[PDB]
Design a protein around this ligand. Structure first.
Ligand SMILES: CC(C)CN1[C@H](c2ccc(/C=C/C(=O)O)cc2)c2ccc(O)cc2C[C@H]1C
Ligand SMILES: CC(C)CN1[C@H](c2ccc(/C=C/C(=O)O)cc2)c2ccc(O)cc2C[C@H]1C
Lengths: 242, 242
């Protein structure tokens, strides 16, 4: 992973991309009946399985301990769903493309208490992606940065292994930074523009964290064992045999 | 503000720095009695007043509308308190320097339910600042970035004025990015190191957002009118006469 060139990093990440999933509802049946939160939860459930497979294909990620892999995914999974959603929605002003068969506006979010506020923040992020003209190659870099960065400050351990793990994570993040800069330099941007755009992109990740926190508050308020993937479920999914 | 050189931006920010405040408790009296949350709340109350004055001195900030100034401070105030705390604590491993007369360890945080988790995240951030050898000039740049960036995606308005306000904010943020790079180039870092360090610094701001969200959850759970500064209080403090 640390021996990869920028071009090789980009190719690895593009190759790792998960598929765009469809919502599971009967399109011949009335929409009034189906539960929006039910549809959204089922979609998120299925997306998480593909996210596990994607994660294992991000350079450097499988170099980490299983425990640390689980910690990183536990911290990042909702941010990763959200940046994916915002990316898919970028060319659909005023709408969130949850799936190709589930394109929702802010008014449709009003059916669930607290959801319109979340819809609005996500729509504003999609708007920002449009204003910056975010590219696919940049998007995959950002998504990988979220995976590696979101949980790296909360390991709460300074065993020798943990010190080594944190060092490796920051080395991989540095490679992704190099890659973003390389993509921008290729696009013809000046050195000033390169640094400015790097900062603009990384600063949006703070807003994505914020959205995830507001989202997790909503989910935890549901007070449900079938909501939020547990440590054990994530561990089970990541702890694969050969 | 947009005509400022990097050196002039740095000088303005260093000059704008608020003072380090002391905790209000009788040092001749027993510590067992005073309320940790009481002490922390009183400190935060007084720090916020100085934060208002600091904010007005960040280049570009008073160019914005009063409403937008209030929105930005409403979004950022706890992040700003937290980055200040982490900076003050950087050279005190295992401790949080709330004030020069109030240096607390994680065990002291245990007196309040939910506080040790917050103490731990803040201590880990201070640790990271140490690992990176964060400089004072870099710190003031980051704090100003938090002020301008934290609320810029949640204006939820596309009046002509709001479009102009968001454009100006991003122009000022670009200047601060230029300034950070200039500070790093001065320090002798290579172009690769410059971009890498810029990214490392901006990525910590996502963790600071996370901490603020966990903090605001704690404060809102207190269910108290004397906790969390209202829109009106912030408006009153910012809406100064001449
Ligand atoms: C309140 C927010 C968290 C709602 N989010 C849903 C979403 C809905 C339910 C879950 C529940 C998952 C679970 O219970 O395991 C997760 C996300 C969702 C679903 C798929 C997706 O691409 C993105 C998002 C982001 C927001 C809308
Ligand atoms: C649960 C966290 C939010 C606790 N934080 C306190 C803090 C305590 C009380 C308030 C309440 C303010 C209010 O009620 O207006 C704010 C921050 C604090 C105080 C001063 C300061 O430098 C930083 C911090 C950050 C964390 C420890």
């Amino acid at each position: 992973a640390l021996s990869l060139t920028a071009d090789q990093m980009v190719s690895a990440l593009l190759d790792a991309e998960p598929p765009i999933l469809y919502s599971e509802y009967d399109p011949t049946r009335p929409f009034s009946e189906a539960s929006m939160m039910g549809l959204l939860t089922n979609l998120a459930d299925r997306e998480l399985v593909h996210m596990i497979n994607w994660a294992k294909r991000v350079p450097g990620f499988v170099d980490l301990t299983l425990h640390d892999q689980v910690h990183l995914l536990e911290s990042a999974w909702l941010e990763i769903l959200m940046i994916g959603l915002v990316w898919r929605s970028m060319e659909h002003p005023g709408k969130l493309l949850f799936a190709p068969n589930l394109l929702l506006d802010r008014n449709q979010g009003k059916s669930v208490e607290g959801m319109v506020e979340i819809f609005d923040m996500l729509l504003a992020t999609s708007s920002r992606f449009r204003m910056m003209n975010l590219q696919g190659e940049e998007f995959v870099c950002l998504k990988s940065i979220i995976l590696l960065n979101s949980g790296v400050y909360t390991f709460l351990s300074s065993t020798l292994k943990s010190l080594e793990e944190k060092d490796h994570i920051h080395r991989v993040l540095d490679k992704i930074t190099d890659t973003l800069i390389h993509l921008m330099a290729k696009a013809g941007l000046t050195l000033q523009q390169q640094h400015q755009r790097l900062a603009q992109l990384l600063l949006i990740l703070s807003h994505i964290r914020h959205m995830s926190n507001k989202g997790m508050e909503h989910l935890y308020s549901m007070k449900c064992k079938n909501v939020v993937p547990s440590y054990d479920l994530l561990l089970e999914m990541l702890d694969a045999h050969r």
